[PDB]
């Protein structure tokens, strides 16, 4: 109950591997989900240029 | 018989290890010295390394320039 | 820029709780505004009013997260009488994570935030103490 | 039958040849580490009448 | 640095921001590129004429020519895109997605 | 070490004349043997890809591969040795010309140095 | 539902093949009896005969490079010397304090 | 040292050029000859080491591991020759090539006079094992197992590399001899704490530690017989060898930092021993037994005393041999049954008596029955831990009790009782399997006659 | 197109890159960039379809904007110092604009968006050329002015590129998008060592170019552009799949393969300058790239996917066109780790 | 398809390999001689 | 990176335009000819770091 299922099969699995897998999947989905509209990418580029000009000097 | 036909004398390993230790010590000191030399040359720039190019002064035209004050 | 960094760092750790909380709230608000701008640029949800509501929510959450962290870290440092201890920063960061989870209303998110930004705050405190450089200049 | 079993059993000579070549290469690497031969304080020795090196 | 150079850089930045806005009309993207080119030509000409860099007078015209060639290329591309859709709307180019 | 601006450097010279004062690598150098082995592996892969008997399809092609690999490896080894010699020469010259930044440490014996002892318990 | 209920054209799962049915004295090495027998013979000769016996004898009679008997004889002669001279066997200091230069405190 | 490496490299050309029906015979014969050649490395000195050259050196810690690695290959070939019968010649040669490459990488890793070369070979051993697990595996989960067995390792090993190069920037040399002779104490600082962690967790992940042991049951279950043998016998010992080699520079910070890992190992040995009691899979049970033994080895290494190191070396050698034998016996059962479940096939002592004797001997030597070297290592580690603290004896005794319990449980469930009625394909055990068991077990009972051969450099 | 026209355009691209590389005047560098961009478009639109045209127009827009900001940076640098030579950039406002322009030309984050789109739109040969040859000129310009870059901005962009490539490559089933994200991650690794050592940058460029050439040529040989299409390759040329898996392991940074050589050295170099956190983050992020490489290898050679009946006919034919440099590229991208010190040749 | 060994290509390959080997040996001999001359060994 | 073909061959493809004080047509001087000339001879061969400092 505790040694085999609760810790070995569930919580030790939940902490290191499963959390990493979930976080990486979420970040990959968020980053890659771009509809292909150059308007959004260009606005993001403008925001990044403004941030670089106002932050790195 | 085994020691005679398979293994060399004790001194062999002793002096081989001495030579190996000497070589590795020289390598370590040379590594530290090279790192320090790199740092000094990059910081000061007087050394042969990290010599970034400047304008060549042979390109300058030394002739009257239609105006006395250059 | 680094004006907020100077304002936050100049204040001593063991004094001026309100000033530290104000600086942390300002930093959090700026970060939340930046995140809101990025989200709006990449994903325009439905309209101007929905977008401004989203920006306000994100900014309040981040400013809110920052406010909780600053007040807790400074109070722990003062009452424990042992400044320059990463444990106080760990406690403050994890309290901020608990508040973030309460805002998001998720026990798992709250616990994960507590752990993952308490560790981050402790690491930042250790780097400040030991002088670790994230962006090292060219030494050699 | 010679020149017939060789075409099938010639692979059996590879490993012993590798072993003797490895012994030769071990001596190869040994010959380059004689900078302190007969020079350690523990085994400073006078050479025998018909001896040139202490160890090879 | 006088105010004229600052205003020219401001015009260039405004043209770049308009290019990055992308309301519609990829033709407007080309127009923003050409406005950026015009600002660059004006600034380069003013700087070169101010300092009496005699040889650098070659610099502006060359730039102009090259940019115009670029413009031509872009125009051609736009036509082909329109030749598929019938309009030069930006949102029609959504087949490729990250 | 950025030797791009080292004074008296010919721009597009693979091997400068002064490199001729260094001992050339032997024809039995292990690095040359590894380059020949890489050429042999490339020949085997070429035979495998084109659906040919891997070991005995083209002897001329494999031998050309090995020979070209050995040639390029020899010249690359020459250049590498020259560059390392240059680096050591520059480092030694800089150390010699700047004695104040490389002082001679006072030699101390372990009998006069107090090192803290940490028991293992 | 006109589907054939077959997802794909696949070979049936083959049954296990017995090495004993087609060839008794099978030795479990190969389906070819001669190659099987020779594989068994070389395995037994190079595992049990060559390595297990000759290697064990070689390890058993390895020369004393660890210096066990040498250390025992050195200790024997050293104790014989110290007992005769009245010295107090092994000293507490591993090094002579005369050649150790302590740092004076003056505190 | 090249007298061992070059024949191992020549093993490849020989296999490829070998006749389509003579690969196994040639490979086994020449691997046994190479093991006989590598037997010469056991002749060590009470002095520093056997420094062959600038690149490779030998030690009485490296020598038994090298001998075991050279000895394992013929056994792996004999075990793998069975289930690869219906397999094409090219792919069988590829399997033998993977085994030879793994042996060559391990042999070069165990000498490794320099730490960066040690890291390079220690991480190069990963690729052949991953290929073997993910290619010649039966279940559909093998791929997942491979992923685990990969990433866990890298998750621990990538920081180590950074630490390693950092040390070379500060110390100036990563050679083991210079590192030992020029070792300096570590100040109790946050930076030194993190350098300690970076140097330690890379080897702790592969032992594995109790917290980081998840990959091991998957990798051992889904791998083929040769993969299980090489994972249990040699690949687990790389972490211990690395820890014993690298703990020299970590002092005196080891005293403070050893506490979390000591507690984790001392409790995880009990946890895994108890897990073994309730297990429906033979391979999983053997894997958890391996985890328990390696946790004891971790405790020994962290205690950092001469008796600790001696017991650790003896225990690694003994555990490697014992786990390889247990996996071989389980695979022999599986090849007849095709279910890999303990409760399915029962009463095998009635049908296969000699295999039952082999099972009994394997269980006894896993049970740490004196005067086996398993017991020698266990007792040395127990005594060193008692010297470290008198309260550890409770946990150690509990671990011994549960170990005996689950070992005899494994023996009784599969060998004793009444046979399964509907199973009728249980053929008599072949000469190959019996020879494999004998070649696994005889070295243990011969090494118990000369324990000092496997007690390490601190003997 | 006419083969003579294609040869002329390829030579024009190469001549533009060489003009960028060998000229000491900023105007000539800009002219070389313009020539390269002008000659690149028809190569991208060799196969006529709406996808190719869309990819080409996206590429044209991005490169024109990058060239225009490059020209503005040159103008500002001239304004604050009457210098046309490519040297220290003098002005800091013109050095930040010179960095973003070269970043968009290279495809570094946050200007990475166009790379997957253009790579997916164009064919395999155009993708090979775009991802291999189009990196020489901007990297050369960056190496020349490396001492002028602010380490903060360049390192931020490199770390962002690595993170974005690693995350975005996980969600891809198309091979061209995978290659584009791999290129983004490798460029991020490349530019993270520019402030410290340009030799490491060039070494990483060479290794990445060799690995990408081998990978793209293997993809061309087994004419598959998706994961499932590549999954059918084992049934005809299994050796191609095995070589592909070895190459993919090489690009994952796994030792003792060739791809481990750059990263290692870069980390080593960055440990000389008292930088520790960033290399660790880079390695932990490159674990993601290795993950999706391993997934592709799983689907490619380590498992046998179901096939189709018609494949039997493909068994009766051989490739008429063969690539001569593929075996050499594979060997160089797999087995050159023992040759590491040769990097002292200032490659 | 149905083709004989192209003796032109075989001859070119053998000639290229032999020429490269001869050039390499000559270059090595010249390098040893030059190094001995500059360093004053023999 | 920089392949100095011009310095290897002595071609002078674009060095004539790099600076203001390099042979303008009809000897027309730059507005800052003297200052550029002084700064260039100050920094010739010295190297970028030392020239800057
Ligand atoms: C005791 C003195 C011995 C002197 C004579 C020398 C004997 C040499 C034998 C060496 C070991 C055998 C090899 C192992 C594989 C087994 C071979 C086999 O398959 O059998 C086929 C063969 C034919 O049987 P079969 O009828 O055809 O098949 C029917 C089925 O197989 C059904 O099979 P089964 O039902 O008949 O069972 C087989 C039998 C035998 O099979 C086994 O299980 C063998 C296992 C033995 C040890 C188990 C591992 C534990 C670790 C101990 C390590 C010590 C090793 C010392 C050095 C060894 C050198 C190689 O099992 C047992 O009887 C249980 C044994 C448990 C005893 C526990 C006590 C251990 C410590 C004893 C003291 C040792 C040191 C003394 C120090 C102080 C005094 C000087 O059977 C035998 O030959 C029996 C062997 C004789 C019994 C040996 C048990 C004691 C020996 C201990 C090790 C040697 C001590 C050296 C000097 C001691 C003084
Ligand atoms: C530490 C370094 C030391 C070790 C070095 C290791 C590397 C060295 C070699 C590097 C590569 C060069 C050679 C490989 C060419 C590939 C050709 C091949 O496939 O083999 C078939 C061929 C025989 O087959 P065949 O009758 O020609 O027709 C069958 C077709 O070829 C094809 O038949 P098929 O298509 O019907 O069969 C399909 C099969 C066929 O597919 C393949 O086999 C592909 C080949 C493997 C890919 C190679 C990648 C490049 C090398 C990477 C090495 C990585 C090293 C790092 C460690 C990590 C390991 C990945 O593919 C599959 O089954 C798919 C699944 C395979 C499993 C997953 C993939 C794992 C493969 C990784 C292997 C890596 C090591 C390769 C070792 C050499 C293998 C030949 O094998 C050979 O005969 C050539 C082997 C070498 C020749 C030895 C001759 C020398 C002996 C005389 C000279 C004595 C020397 C000493 C001098 C002094 C004495 C007096
Ligand atoms: C079937 C029933 C039995 C029938 C047979 C009856 C006969 C019984 C006899 C068998 C056991 C009874 C005990 C008798 C033991 C006497 C022999 C013993 O004394 O020799 C030992 C010798 O044994 C060896 O030392 C141990 C064996 C070597 C271990 C290597 C294993 C073989 C290599 C295979 C690969 C390794 C794989 C594992 C990797 C490590 C110890 O010798 P030692 O007192 O010290 O000194 C030797 C003499 N000196 C002084 C001159 C030096
Ligand atoms: C998950 C399965 C197992 C995986 C491996 C787990 C083992 C790794 C754990 C590492 C050991 C602990 C790390 C640091 C230990 C230092 C000792 C410390 O605990 O004691 C006090 C330290 O005080 C507090 O602990 C401050 C640190 C608090 C922040 C740490 C977070 C606490 C819980 C987080 C656990 C998560 C770890 C795993 C992250 C992925 C002493 O106070 P002080 O004398 O002043 O400091 C002495 C050290 N100096 C000299 C360098 C300054
Ligand atoms: C992936 C492995 C590498 C493969 C590389 C391709 C191999 C085929 C190339 C064929 C020969 C190319 C050499 C060119 C001939 C003459 C070159 C000479 O004129 O240039 C010199 C320089 O020579 C070349 O740079 C050396 C190229 C040699 C590349 C080999 C290094 C590979 C890295 C280590 C991996 C081991 C690979 C071994 C197998 C190939 C002068 O350079 P310089 O004008 O003053 O400054 C520019 C360079 N800076 C800016 C960095 C300072
Ligand atoms: C900073 C960034 C750090 C990045 C760290 C990367 C860790 C390496 C693992 C990356 C895996 C991410 C991908 C992933 O998990 O996807 C979910 C994926 C879904 O399966 P798919 O085959 O992709 O598709 C199925 C549906 N058709 O889930 C899985 O299968 C994962 C199974 C194997 C997990 C691998 C083990 C990873 C954990 C081990 C420890 C590493 C943790 C990271 C470092 C820890 C901090 C020191
Ligand atoms: C199976 C998964 C296990 C994962 C293992 C991870 C544990 C290792 C520790 C984290 C990585 C640290 C790598 C550092 C490499 C050693 C270099 C070093 O120690 O030098 C320090 C650098 O120390 C650091 O910078 C370390 C900062 C850590 C940054 C990365 C954080 C990663 C996660 C930390 C939380 C986890 C802590 C415990 C993890 C245990 C694993 C479960 C000195 O820096 P300087 O600037 O040169 O000093 C000058 C002034 N004296």
UniProtKB/TrEMBL annotation, chain A:
It comes from the Eukaryota. The chain crosses the membrane at residues 36-57. It is found in: Mitochondrion inner membrane. Core subunit of the mitochondrial membrane respiratory chain NADH dehydrogenase (Complex I) which catalyzes electron transfer from NADH through the respiratory chain, using ubiquinone as an electron acceptor. Essential for the catalytic activity and assembly of complex I. Belongs to the complex I subunit 5 family. This is NADH-ubiquinone oxidoreductase chain 5. The chain holds residues 547 to 603 of 606 of the full protein.
UniProtKB/TrEMBL annotation, chain B:
It comes from the Eukaryota. Residues 11-43 form a coiled coil. It is found in: Mitochondrion inner membrane. Belongs to the complex I NDUFB5 subunit family. Complex I is composed of 45 different subunits. Accessory subunit of the mitochondrial membrane respiratory chain NADH dehydrogenase (Complex I), that is believed not to be involved in catalysis. Complex I functions in the transfer of electrons from NADH to the respiratory chain. The immediate electron acceptor for the enzyme is believed to be ubiquinone. This is NADH dehydrogenase [ubiquinone] 1 beta subcomplex subunit 5, mitochondrial. It comes from Sus scrofa. The chain holds residues 120 to 189 of 189 of the full protein.
TrEMBL record, chain C:
The keyword Aminoacyl-tRNA synthetase does not apply. Disulfide bonds join 17-74, 94-114. GO terms for biological process: mitochondrial electron transport, NADH to ubiquinone. Its main location: mitochondrion. One of its GO terms (cellular component) is respiratory chain complex I. It comes from the Eukaryota. Keywords: Membrane, Mitochondrion, Mitochondrion inner membrane, Transmembrane, Transmembrane helix, Ubiquinone. The keyword Transmembrane helix applies. InterPro entries: NDUFA11. It is a multi-pass membrane protein. It is found in: Mitochondrion inner membrane. Belongs to the complex I NDUFA11 subunit family. This is NADH dehydrogenase [ubiquinone] 1 alpha subcomplex subunit 11. It comes from Sus scrofa. The gene is NDUFA11.
Automatic annotation (TrEMBL), chain F:
The chain crosses the membrane at residues 61-77. Coiled coil: none annotated. Its main location: mitochondrion. Keywords: Electron transport, Membrane, Mitochondrion, Mitochondrion inner membrane, Respiratory chain, Transmembrane, Transmembrane helix, Transport, Ubiquinone. It holds the Pfam family NDUF_C2. It is a single-pass membrane protein. It is found in: Mitochondrion inner membrane. The keyword Transmembrane helix applies. One of its GO terms (biological process) is mitochondrial respiratory chain complex I assembly. InterPro entries: NDUC2 (IPR009423). One of its GO terms (cellular component) is respiratory chain complex I. The keyword Cytoplasm does not apply. PANTHER family: NADH DEHYDROGENASE [UBIQUINONE] 1 SUBUNIT C2-RELATED, NADH-UBIQUINONE OXIDOREDUCTASE SUBUNIT B14.5B. Belongs to the complex I NDUFC2 subunit family. Accessory subunit of the mitochondrial membrane respiratory chain NADH dehydrogenase (Complex I), that is believed not to be involved in catalysis. Complex I functions in the transfer of electrons from NADH to the respiratory chain. The immediate electron acceptor for the enzyme is believed to be ubiquinone. This is NADH dehydrogenase [ubiquinone] 1 subunit C2.
